[PDB]
Design a binder for these strands. Structure first.
Lengths: 65, 262, 67, 66, 262, 65, 67, 67, 65, 66, 67, 66, 65, 67, 262
RNA sequence: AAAAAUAACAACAAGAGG
RNA sequence: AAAAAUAACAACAAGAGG
């Protein structure tokens, strides 16, 4: 796979992410943790996002694997 | 309860519709205000008693050259005022606007140049559309309510035409035309009467003279009742009766819950 | 799955008012009462069911703590 | 499937009118005749085959419980 | 025929007004939706059966700190939905917005911060004002009708205050406060439900607690029913009673020509 | 998959004018010639392959079964 | 998959110019040459790989047959 | 099965600047830097990931075919 | 004085539609029936009297004299 | 002069008039009496409308001038 | 001539409350104490002189008739 | 003629600070220092000339007697 | 006086004027002829402007008196 | 008639940059060329005519002599 | 096509800029309005026919003590109006405001007392700016879109000076005056033409009379084109040249994308 | 708290929420 | 074709017609 090590390395180094949904809307925060169907996103409140609604994950800084 | 019926048939000549059976139909429809666009007859040719529907007051504003415009309005109740002209040159001279002022609402009738006669007609249509957007910007600060019974010759959306991909280049579905009707209906707040009670597809107001373009219902929707926002909740019915027609255009019959007064 | 069940069940137990955003941008505000593998019931004033394939995100109105 | 099925079954065998909101916003109000793992058949003037990957929410007119 | 009454009294604490006989008056006014702002009570305080009017549902929205805002809503028939909070921070945190979605209309209950204590409240008021304008820019695209029964704490015109020359500096009649209501009512197209029927003067909705200012009637007007443009022809009887007041404010009873439905 | 099979088979073998309302709001009206999983075929002047993961509803225009 | 593989294979052997309609409504015109369980290759001035999860209908320009 | 991964590896090797199209109808240019079975990555200025469930189409900018 | 009555009588005789602007911006519009030293009267549908001390201008619809 | 016969003919027949002032305000009533300078009309209380503030006087029934 | 001096002098000597409406819509409550054929004087706190060429109407709150 | 002449002379003698209101609503504080049949001189930080036909009311601040 | 010789000089050599009304509306044109009570303006149709609506008369090209 | 014209003469001889407020509240600066019994003229860039029955107030920006 | 060039110059004396060659630059730059602050001359001094530029109109307002103030304005066509001064004695006695008045826009040259001859002139500057803010409180309601060519002698924010740590106490960078001009030209919504094209500093308009300041470059950006927010989005070009400078200040050349007309 | 449904935008680097 | 009426904007160089 690729999403699991990439989101692990996006989590542990506290990379701020901008997440774009299939409706076109933008979410921002750190990743808390993730699972086969969900991503939990931290900002003003602990938020849940469903993987089946995310189009893209855009980091703030360059991250590497 | 209180009801009101308003008809906005484009006639392409009140004489041709009269010999094809317009008045014998409009007497038997029981409407309060009948609006007619492209009368194509001078005001001396209308007070001839061939055109008087019984029990209806007739008010007409012709064009200067009596073949290019001319717009009539029958009304059951006698209005408080009957005015003509929008103030700019392409309506005051070609006779493309008449208005009957009543108690709280005022019903006006409106014609636009089609832009299918030539390129200069499309320039005239663009001038009329721009300064009529200026007039609707001027009317936003006023306190009456308006029912513009227009034959705008602009199809608003893809639902309003059959085979919309073939029609992008033809006038009636150009991008400034659809942008104009997305400015008036979307941004200026004015409501469309036929869209408030029915959003089905194949409802059209105009057919070209090919019989092939009539059996396959290759239509366009050009007839509208533009409404101020204080009337978008009073519309009960809005239908375009396809078959009993007296021109290229279809009649547009709308039932409102308003009690029209004097 | 693993983070899925712990979150929704804790919003269920403590009566936290949620705002489920569906994939159109419709905000259904309410209160998670129960959920299976596929649907979530919420109770604002009439108890409705919500399919998870039509959900984009769940945002609470106050924080929640997960083990 | 533990909570998918008894809710629609209580909507089914009691013949109470329901309101299905689809994924683009279309509401479809009528009755539920039967359902599958993938399909609901709605009842109005004619029956409908609602695929349940387009359904979003289900609002009953009067409330039910399992 | 059809009728609907909505009352929007401000209570200055529902506990201090329930001792003064608020609920026994609201039971006898025959209202369909009763709007209450500045409740100053928690979520379990309105669960106690002192406030449960029979034949009504009671929904409330409390603050984090229960002394600052809190807004409640009684209803005759059950809403389709009841949501809270405008989405930004100076609205939901303090319990200042509660919205009841019915069939075609939805009745919301809004409470602005007064801005009469100090600059910490006045800057807070201005940020609520412009973020509320920003929210109202987003509701110009939807197909619902709204009745925002607000205690906006801003008087609109020179008719809504007594001795306006002495009130240009006091908070409640400032120039960036009057321009906000001149923008909500003028440019956004919303209507004032008391101005649509009666433009008599001296209709005041608020008084300071001194006795001289309440028998010489030098009071202001803070409570409005902000209406979408689709409802400006439905108001029959908007009335501000002066004598049976249960706080510094007066009730605002508006009778409409609508049928409330689920 | 236990009660969509006789429904589409009944709409096919009686040859009624149906309308498939898609997910994005488009209706396609015509008549069903064959039904399978993942795929329905809508027959008209042209015969097209509609996928089943883009269909909201299927309706016949006159009451059948 | 009892019919989409013969339908697309008959549609590529006869070299039919076809219109793919996407589920947001983007008419792609081209000529389908190779197709998977998942993807369909569309030849034009370029050679695109379209996914089947974003296709609503596949419309040919002339009537085709089945063996 | 077998015609998606060779095409996608083929545009992976020669480092072609592709345009990904999402099912909301928007475009995203860039060089593909890695991929696997459920997400296609896209190296622009930043290194982002793009789900396949929400990729509408994959188009190259110059005609290269698959071996 | 010497210019007002031939102008109003020219507008009255040929039944020329005039647009009387008032001093507040209200465009009355109709035909002139008669006039005197102080009051004109115009008809659109009902005949009304209009005092001359509220008339800003008088605008005919077609050029005369 | 049609000023004074028009107002007398509205007065004898007792026609309900509507008087539009110079600021858009209308005042509906019946002309009781008038001078060369003022006009007394009654709807609820008797009221002395000055003529220098009248723009128009429209009658509700159509009238005839002698 | 003969129809405003009985009206104004009758509202003097019976001391009715009047409301004088100006030609910009302003309403002035008081009582008519004195008048020539050019001005009206009225009183509630301080005796003001309202000019007659900016009075649009004179409306008494109690009905009156002239002798 | 018979009632505004004493009422304005009794405000230019006692120099009462008057508040003279125009016909469009504009308020003008000052002191009346002269008046003929047509104009009124209003003295303040500058001394200006107000025509009588633009004046609606003339109020004083403290009450005066004719 | 000074009014009537001014307007006579304005109407002889046909100055394009802008007449500003008391409510603010400006009206441009050439002064055809006038009298004691009205001023008859003309650019595209002769309109009878009453003097008691006229606040100012503004000539564009500065004239001698 | 007995007090206006010496005031306008004293404003005429000395070039006092006077200001004229109209009855709708429009402010016209300038100097007084000449006047008659109905009209004041205004000296600025282009010489204006202004009727007295639209003039509200004449105010000099210079403290000048009273008649 | 579109070109509206106005250039604001602080000559610090017409007699002083007459020796360097001001007029041979003004004729060549092709500007539609040339605004001048600190003309420092009487009116009959500018009646001397050596001073007028070719093809333009000259207007000027004098001081009483003539070397202290006085402003001027050059315009290609004669305007509708030339109004002088605001109406209060710390702007008319010393003559620091002159406004030519065209259609849809008006150009006003604005000058302030310096504050560089003691604390009393700094208090004079605060008093003049106080009455100027009270003036904009009356001007915030018109529709004449205003362009104020003004020498305010105060830089707005941090990057409009160099070495501000010592310059906190010099006249021009006072912390109450900075915060108060942030309060004024904030909420009132006015703008400048400089910030619409460049959000970085390093562009200046005042220097002391010492080459010690010139090879070290401590700067002061003073000259503004105050723009009411209808012309916020219509700055065509704006440039500050510190090479052919005609005094202690530098010119300010601003193109606006309209057509100035009468 | 949602258009009983646009026979269909060769494609809005994306509307912290239509 | 017009707010049964703003106890009153020390004053919109002026809305081809509020």
């Amino acid at each position: 796979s690729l999403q699991d090590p990439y989101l692990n390395t996006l989590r542990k180094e506290r990379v701020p992410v901008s997440i774009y949904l299939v409706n076109g809307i933008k979410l921002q925060g750190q990743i808390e943790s993730f699972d086969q169907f969900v991503i939990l996103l931290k900002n003003t409140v602990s938020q849940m996002v469903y993987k089946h609604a995310i189009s893209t994950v855009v980091p703030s800084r360059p991250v590497r694997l | 309860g209180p009801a009101m019926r308003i008809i906005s048939v484009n006639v392409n000549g009140i004489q041709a519709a009269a010999e094809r059976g317009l008045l014998s139909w409009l007497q038997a429809q029981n409407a309060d205000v009948i609006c007619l666009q492209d009368t194509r007859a001078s005001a001396f040719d209308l007070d001839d008693p061939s055109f008087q529907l019984d029990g209806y007051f007739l008010y007409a504003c012709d064009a200067e050259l009596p073949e290019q415009g001319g717009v009539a309005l029958y009304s059951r109740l006698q209005p408080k005022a009957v005015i003509s002209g929008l103030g700019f040159e392409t309506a005051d001279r070609y006779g493309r606007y008449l208005q009957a002022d009543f108690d709280k609402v005022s019903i006006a009738t409106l014609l636009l140049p089609s832009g299918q006669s030539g390129d200069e007609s499309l320039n005239q249509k663009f001038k009329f559309m721009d300064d009529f957007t200026h007039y609707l910007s001027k009317q936003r600060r006023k306190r009456r309510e308006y029912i513009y019974c227009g034959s705008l010759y602009v199809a608003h959306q893809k639902m309003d035409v059959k085979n919309w991909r073939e029609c992008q280049q033809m006038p009636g579905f150009l991008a400034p035309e659809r942008a104009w009707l997305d400015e008036v209906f979307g941004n200026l707040g004015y409501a469309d009467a036929l869209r408030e009670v029915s959003r089905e597809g194949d409802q059209f107001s105009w057919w070209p003279d090919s019989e092939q373009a009539e059996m396959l219902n290759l239509g366009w929707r050009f007839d509208y009742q533009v409404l101020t926002p204080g009337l978008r909740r009073f519309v009960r019915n809005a239908k375009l009766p396809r078959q009993p027609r007296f021109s290229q255009h279809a009649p547009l019959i709308v039932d409102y819950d308003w009690q029209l007064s004097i």
